[PDB]
Structure 1
Amino acid sequence: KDIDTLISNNALWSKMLVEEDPGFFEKLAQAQKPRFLWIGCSDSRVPAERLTGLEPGELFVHRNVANLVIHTDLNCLSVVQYAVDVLEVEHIIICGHYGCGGVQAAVENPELGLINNWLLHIRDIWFKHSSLLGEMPQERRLDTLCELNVMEQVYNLGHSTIMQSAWKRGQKVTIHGWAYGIHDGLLRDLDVTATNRETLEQRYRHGISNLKLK
């Protein structure tokens, strides 16, 4: 699967749509504004279009390593602010995935070079929930960290100035934390949904105690 193969597939796929479904390229030319912002991992095990049955132009996307929303990452923060203040999306979905190489490397902590600084933020979370994790069986720990990561990133995004001041002026925006597994591509909703300052907090706290129950 060389590069010249990608060029040639694209050419066959485009040449077939031009003549056979003129549809497509008009839907895109409709240039309709996105309504969701997907914040996912660069592993991109199962593309978000495939996972949700969303069409091109309906998803705004950011992908870094391990779905993080770092308080001071201007790259991710810039995606969010464009999305919210300019594109006026209504839904921001942060979605992790069980078996994430990033999450796993955060715990095993191999010497991988520069990436380990990025992965320190996920380690912060593993130690933050030491007790919660030490109480559940050794074999369900990684998956749970993957879930906590996503809860924490939802927490962070809600505390961003972008989101706090978007809610405060009345604009409708809803954050969601999800995860999918690769055994079945099924999206599990983590029930940490937020539409203002209050739910954000409630749902996050509820989210941590719901985990303490195992």
Structure 2
Amino acid sequence: DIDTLISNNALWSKMLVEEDPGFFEKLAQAQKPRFLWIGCSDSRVPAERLTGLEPGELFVHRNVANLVIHTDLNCLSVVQYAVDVLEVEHIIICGHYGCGGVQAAVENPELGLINNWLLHIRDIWFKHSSLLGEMPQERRLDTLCELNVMEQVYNLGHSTIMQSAWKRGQKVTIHGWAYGIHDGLLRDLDVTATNRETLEQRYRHGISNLKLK
């Protein structure tokens, strides 16, 4: 309960204050994050734990099914601030196998308001219908999870924010990853782009190397 959490915070804080009174000293030392993590609200496994990144190195955004919608100002505001103000060098979009958002999109359950958000994933399911169709029933949702991350990476790269940052020569690299709850091992979908040209090439080869695998 809320009481338990409050208790935890107290103890947790107390402990650190003693053992490592410097812990809060480091944090007090303004360290601009160098990475922007865009993941799902499910947050099955915190980004910090998966990567060993320490708090302060990560600027974070989370929504249902880790989407980067062309016109979602919430995510775009996070991206623009991180890129233009914090000047992060890396942006990572991470999905996860078994994601409830991804599943709900396909198993179209009348969940309410949230379904509108999920229609963006449904567009993807239909876009890659042949590929998804030509494969085992049990492999489709996971493949869709990967297709989603790749499509969002593509959207991120085409945002005016990224196009303008690359055009002016700023150094920003975007990545697309995914992981399962059975080992928490990150899988690089290999759609890493450092400019507008590689974005296209990596998108193309990524989608095609799935049809081959």
TM-score of the pair, normalised by structure 2: 0.99
Following TM superposition, by how much is the alpha carbon of 1:23 offset from its aligned partner in structure 2, in angstroms?
Answer: 1.9
1:199 aligns to what SS in structure 2? helix
Following TM superposition, by how much is the alpha carbon of 1:136 offset from its aligned partner in structure 2, in angstroms?
Answer: 1.5
How many residues are matched?
213
Most deviating of 7-16 and 20-29:
20-29
Deviation per CA, 1:105-161: give whole Å up to 9, x if none: 000000000000000000000000000111111110000000000000000000000
Mapped to 2, the partners of 1:21 and 1:165 lie a distance apart of 43
Deviation per CA, 1:13-43: give whole Å up to 9, x if none: 0011112101211110111100000000000
Mapped to 1, the partners of 2:22 and 2:191 lie a distance apart of 38
Mapped to 1, the partners of 2:114 and 2:139 lie a distance apart of 25
Mapped to 1, the partners of 2:136 and 2:198 lie a distance apart of 30
Deviation per CA, 1:87-116: give whole Å up to 9, x if none: 000000000000000000000000000000
Correspondence for 1:106? 105
Correspondence for 1:92? 91
Following TM superposition, by how much is the alpha carbon of 1:80 offset from its aligned partner in structure 2, in angstroms?
Answer: 0.1
Most deviating of 24-33 and 83-92:
24-33
Following TM superposition, by how much is the alpha carbon of 1:46 offset from its aligned partner in structure 2, in angstroms?
Answer: 0.3
Following TM superposition, by how much is the alpha carbon of 1:61 offset from its aligned partner in structure 2, in angstroms?
Answer: 0.2
Following TM superposition, by how much is the alpha carbon of 1:210 offset from its aligned partner in structure 2, in angstroms?
Answer: 0.4
Structure 1 residue runs of 5 or longer lacking an equivalent are none
1:212 aligns to what SS in structure 2? helix
Correspondence for 1:170? 169
Following TM superposition, by how much is the alpha carbon of 1:48 offset from its aligned partner in structure 2, in angstroms?
Answer: 0.3
2:212 aligns to what SS in structure 1? coil
Mapped to 1, the partners of 2:188 and 2:22 lie a distance apart of 33
Mapped to 1, the partners of 2:111 and 2:52 lie a distance apart of 35
Most deviating of 15-24 and 73-82:
15-24
Mapped to 2, the partners of 1:20 and 1:208 lie a distance apart of 50
Most deviating of 20-29 and 183-192:
20-29
Mapped to 2, the partners of 1:201 and 1:170 lie a distance apart of 18
Mapped to 2, the partners of 1:137 and 1:48 lie a distance apart of 30
Following TM superposition, by how much is the alpha carbon of 1:198 offset from its aligned partner in structure 2, in angstroms?
Answer: 0.7
Sequence identity (%) = 100
Mapped to 1, the partners of 2:136 and 2:18 lie a distance apart of 57
Deviation per CA, 1:44-87: give whole Å up to 9, x if none: 00000010001010100000000000000000000000000000
